[PDB]
Amino acid sequence: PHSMRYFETAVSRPGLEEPRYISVGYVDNKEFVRFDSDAENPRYEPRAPWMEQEGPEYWERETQKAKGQEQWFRVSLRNLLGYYNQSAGGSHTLQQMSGCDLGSDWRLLRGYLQFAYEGRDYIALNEDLKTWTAADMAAQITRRKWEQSGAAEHYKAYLEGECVEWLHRYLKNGNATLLRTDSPKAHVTHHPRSKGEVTLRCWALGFYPADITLTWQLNGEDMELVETRPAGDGTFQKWASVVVPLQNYTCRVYHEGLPEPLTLRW
Amino acid sequence: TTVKQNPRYKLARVGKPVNLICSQTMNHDTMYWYQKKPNQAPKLLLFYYDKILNREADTFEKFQSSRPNNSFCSLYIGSAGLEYSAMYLCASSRGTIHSNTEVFFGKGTRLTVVEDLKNVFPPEVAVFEPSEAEISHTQKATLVCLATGFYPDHVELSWWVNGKEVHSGVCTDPQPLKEQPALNDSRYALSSRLRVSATFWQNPRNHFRCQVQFYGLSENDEWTQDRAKPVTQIVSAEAWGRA
């Protein structure tokens, strides 16, 4: 499983003609680059601790593409405002998700190109990389404009070429800092409640990445399962509670790094 | 497909304003306006990124511009001057300024600013029959055409044999001579040649014609003079086969 994504954000400012553009890149759900407009000296800055293997030619060339993208979203924000005939006062947000995932062996499996205006979906490139999917009447205007020009061929060449080729460079430069997994530590805390019942809580502290599954298997198969939250230092944490009256039960933990499921009471 | 740019030539007096249009069929988001003087590289004056004027170039505010829609863009000169006489070029690219897309250029528009429309003069075309000595010493005949007293260097010399424009065996001067190369505003002179076989010239049914297209004044310009108006007109001279 190896992936690469480019999450672009464009939030306009009330009254100001220049909005704020944010381009953040990810390699296997891990951020390595970040660009901002409100920062003093807007340039691409290395976020990953292994991004020192790039010369000044890479940081200047990427800065050029970020400055160009900044102008593209600036115009597209005004073009979209007129489509819905929105009031020229408030601030609006335009987002884009462009990239591709390969899998175990390094080969293209699925390309991705999506656009979303104000959280809601707007236009997306299909799996065939030739036709587009629109959300409403205003999105159909963008579709005919991009089909008349033939923009589908331009985006197909990036996802097949430039994105795959540059992902191989990152995968080889930082293979030791990417393939690093940790076993999750478990502990169950006891808590009494009304009517003589006991609430059990299966904790999991210290795992990377957050792709984990905690299920309550009672004698070989109502439950309160919360979303995974990060610790902050570079690891993830998750817990699951069950309301059962009063007797020891087990909770199966499924992790990709662990060959056998780790489960232990108390 | 390409960048349309009209007019081909523009004639204006010092003080009077000048409008320059440009258009493109493609949905190009970036449009440009260059100024190219003789013996010089094109200098950027301004660029547009979808109704966004970036007049960073041209640090003296010598030009104006207006881009109403994605297809059309204009360049305006408030008060013309001798400093503005140059070939104005228009261009367009697919992406933004930071993209690496091909910049397509227009055919240009040659503008010449004059001190007064009084000096504007149409050419006097004249053909010259080949010398009998040349026909005897060589098996070829050469007709020379002379377009003289034209101002201001806005001519296109073409050869027409039997009502069809001929190019083979034709040569025209790239630079026109000045009648008074010491003082400015002097009328220009141009010479061209047409070489054919001696047998082609001996036939009295072959029609040779030197056509000069002059680009001068328009119907809007007020002409107050006894001398004929130097309007945009064609001046020609013809010769018949002699034996």
Partner: peptide
Amino acid sequence: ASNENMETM
């Protein structure tokens, strides 16, 4: 290696 968009919305 970020992507570059051509035709605006």
